[PDB]
């Protein structure tokens, strides 16, 4: 399949070189997988999701995304137009309020909640959890992500937006999950993106067009926007039979575009998520 004039990041994770705008992909498009977006929620009514999104939990007085963040990240995962894996099932878990603030212990709860709930869902092709959130370092927050991964969910986490070494941030530093740094449309590391030997992979993070609440779209930036590109890619790869939830971070690294980003500090992998479809 081909989707012309695509947001740059979808074209980028289907290309070897920057500077084009078509997204080349296999039409199975994540059918039969599932992705949990752990965030401010998902406006499931947004037609872009076409009936393929459900809130299934909240830790606040409402399950709605009243912030837009969770809706945008979810759109990059799996909206019809702006998503990677256009036919995956989406599940929302609202751990962030509407200003986009969550206490750790609520983030921990929602993470254990996925390890359990996946068992209430039909996801024959694999299950993925996309966490576009983080803060300082916590053994506990890290341990919750390592349980979610261990429970057979591919866990994708934002490396963080301070321009540092992500080894001081959580859940990013947790070593056993897949920590996602950011790039721009000219293959630069985004000027914020965190870096450090705990990163596994980069995906598109700077000027990412996706869904926003009210039915609407906006183009925002962050490792938060890079993270659901690599979650959706993993759903896409499960579904194709290439990899598995345990194995997907390694498979994505093995098949990445290798050398191609500017400003990988020393010591940070220079790897750019790639679907290997067109070549
Ligand atoms: Ca890893």
UniProtKB/Swiss-Prot annotation:
Keyword Metal-binding assigned: yes
Organism for this UniProt entry: Parengyodontium album
Top-rank taxon: Eukaryota
Phosphoprotein is among the record's keywords: no
Disulfide bonds: 34-123, 178-249
Record-stated family: Belongs to the peptidase S8 family.
Residues where Ca(2+) 1 binds: 175, 177, 200
Keywords in alphabetical order: Calcium, Disulfide bond, Hydrolase, Metal-binding, Protease, Serine protease, Signal, Zymogen
Active-site residues, Swiss-Prot/TrEMBL: 39, 69, 224
Cofactors that this protein relies on: Ca(2+)
GO biological process, one term: proteolysis
The protein's role, per its UniProt record: Hydrolyzes keratin at aromatic and hydrophobic residues.
EC category name: hydrolase
E.C. number(s) listed in UniProt: 3.4.21.64
Sequence intervals crossing the membrane: none
Domain spans labelled Peptidase S8: 7-279
Catalytic activity: Hydrolysis of keratin, and of other proteins with subtilisin-like specificity. Hydrolyzes peptide amides
Positions contributing to Ca(2+) 2 binding: 16, 260
Co-factor remark: Binds 2 calcium ions per subunit.
Cellular compartments per GO CC: extracellular region
GO MF entries: metal ion binding; serine-type endopeptidase activity
Range of the intact protein held here: 106 to 384 of 384
Protein name stated in the entry: Proteinase K
